[PDB]
Amino acid sequence: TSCPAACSCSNQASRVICTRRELAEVPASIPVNTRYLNLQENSIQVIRTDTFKHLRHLEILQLSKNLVRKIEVGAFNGLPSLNTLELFDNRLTTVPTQAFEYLSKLRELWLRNNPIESIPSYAFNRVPSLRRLDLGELKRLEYISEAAFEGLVNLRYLNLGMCNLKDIPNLTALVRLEELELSGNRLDLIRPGSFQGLTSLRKLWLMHAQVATIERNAFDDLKSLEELNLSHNNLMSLPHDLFTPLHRLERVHLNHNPWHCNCDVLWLSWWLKETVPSNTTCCARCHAPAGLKGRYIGELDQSHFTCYAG
Template sequence: CVTVHHTWNAALVLLFYLSARMWSVCAASGREQSCPTICSCSNQFSKVVCTRRGLREVPQGIPSNTRYLNLMENDIQLIQADTFRHLYHMEVLQLGRNSIRQIEVGAFNGLTSLNTLELFENRLTVIPSGAFESFSKLRELWLRNNPIESIPSYAFNRVPSLLRLDLGELRKLAYISEGAFAGLINLKYLNLGMCNLRDMPNLTPLVGLEELEMSSNHFPQIQPGSFLGLKSLRKLWLMNSQISVIERNAFDDLTDLVELNLAHNNLSSLPHDLFAPLRYLVQLHLHHNPWNCTCDILWLAWWLREYIPNNFTCCGRCHTPAHMRGKYVTEVDPGSFQCSGPVILEPPQNVNISEGRTVKLRCRTADMASVRWLLPNNTELSHGSAHPRLSVFNNGTLHFLHVLLTDAGTYTCTVANMVGASAASALLHVTMAEINTANYTYFSTVTVETTPETVRTKVPPFLSTPPTYKPVFISTPTVLLQSTRSPRPALVVPTPDSSDLIRASLDEVMRTTKIIIGCFVAVTLLAAAMLIIFYKLRKRHQQRSTVAAARTIEIINVEEEMAGGGPGEGGGGSVPSVHDHMNYNTYKPAHRAHWTDNSLGNSLHTTIPEPFIIQTHNKDKVQETQI
């Protein structure tokens, strides 16, 4: 009985513990999934809508399993760091139509699953590139209608996964860097409409772009290369952009284009065969343009009837001349005009060039005519054609990056319009490359022994000097004529290869340079040695002059005769011996000095730098004499 009682108590305790545990889990789960009071939630708290609530900041308590968060049409001004840190499952974040002026670095930390970020119609003046570092799956970014003034280089390189980028209506945009779109290799859609652009930005990095919206800008002229690299582009919108001129070959890079909209511009004509490279173009909008329906429009009318049949309204009506006004462009009849074929204004000229040089063959014609080149191997080349070394410029010029010997031949330029065609040819003559010897010229001497008979010598042909400077190898043959009775066969001296000549010449230059440097060093050392010798000789000369000056004899005449010869006679003062002293103006006699012949002799050999005055103690009159 006691055992049953203990078992029953243990079961009750376990049941109580499990109940408490379940209650705490439920309570915690309820707290996590609670919806902010100012918002509305649905789909088990995965969708949270907080629009038009007058919010000035992001509300607290957003459920952690939220996938869709709408905060549009509020008064949020600042997005602080780590605001959404706990929302790991967020996929769509809508912050459009707020007053956001600043987004701090790290504001989107934690949003690793986000694929759509909407920031349109706010007050951002710069692109918050630093806040994009947390995005690894972002697919769409909306920045439309913000007062952004410039787009710097690598503004979006932190989000290479981006597929759609909306930058439309940036009316204060004044500058787009050349590398603004670097890194967006996966981008499919780009909107730059209504941005007041006057120049086409650099779109080359967008190799995967398929749709481009550029409407409502200011592009008076579309030039070749404006869409360089956009091989994958399928849709291009350029409506209402004040376009008046589209140059020849402007769309040659858009080989996959399907839809082109040029409506509502100022176009009056288009270059011949402008759409020829667009093999897949099926939707073309040219309406609301002031078309001039003359000879230059005939090709367009034919092309529209041929490639876009049963759509007369796509391409507008004639504006001039007066008798054609209101007529559809596709209805223009070639019989209505008297047109002539194109004229080549600047035909190509024959060219002699050495191998490896750059050369251009010009073929200038009217802007509305097409230009094609026929190569010597019967290959046809036009602007945009793929060739490793040859290219055709927009003005019809054929450009050789560097010519080869195999490029020699006849090149034919053909210009055409709807009425006919004209052609002109030029001969390209290519010679062997000259020896490039940097900044020096080499001379070689060839000596040939011959007989009075015909001299057979192999002399390399003279190469024409190109306009630009290049050192030329000059061979100066020296012929030694020697008459003999028995004729000898002609001696042909082989000419060394250019590489051997260059190598030998370089060795000679190095040897000459070493000799010059050695001579310079030798002359410098000799000059230094001479300078040292001169200095030592001058110093020795000065020392000898000093010794001679020290031997100067001072003759001193004393008016008063000294009585006696010894020290004890007459009480007269004795003349002391002269000693070498550094003080030349004061003489101090030696104690008990005696005037003797020996002392006088010693005084004559004493070294004294300059004359001095001997003063006596007995008011003698002293006479100075300097020899």
């Protein structure tokens, strides 16, 4: 139950903290009783095979805010009690597939803000047990395999926010997914099959996604959807019946969009009235035309614009 020189060991050596230190490598003599390890804010560059083999009881392992660029094969061997593994704010150029060793208890994996360039096929089929995955802020990402998320039949939260994404990737593997964060992407056009097989999804976020066009039927698959955020995008209108199938959708953010208020958006105003009736004049405003400018989309009706069948 010894404490390493550079760490502060609480309890009977269950909670070990080693932060704000100038650690170049992972310290030794970590007591076997450790269930929590915080090595955040250090200068660690490499993690080696069996570095943690002796820690049977480790549940939470925080290796974030470091310089980690190399994670050798079987680096996390010997950690069958491990739940959460944090690796954000590091210098990983690729996802550390090899490091994984069917860690059935692993539930959270945090990799945001790393210079990862691509997520290859079957990247996480050593860790099917994952519930939360954080792949946000991967600003040098250029490719996601179609089979990248295969095996993650238990994933519930995914974060692909702030990754330069011209297109939504294949997420048909993520059968049980509930929250998807796609904000801060270059998602220009949203085609009909963009969220195929995400029938379990409840919250979807597309804030600051440079979304100009949403084609008809683009959300048909999201049958469980409750919340949507299309705020701070470039939407001028939404296609007919975009929400008719989404029976449970109760919260929609539409603000900060150059909404053009003509009869193409008549349906939406009525959807707003039926779905969120307490909102009389707030807070999704028309930019065009003048005379309708500043007005809440959902306060408009048939007298405000001329309507045809084509």
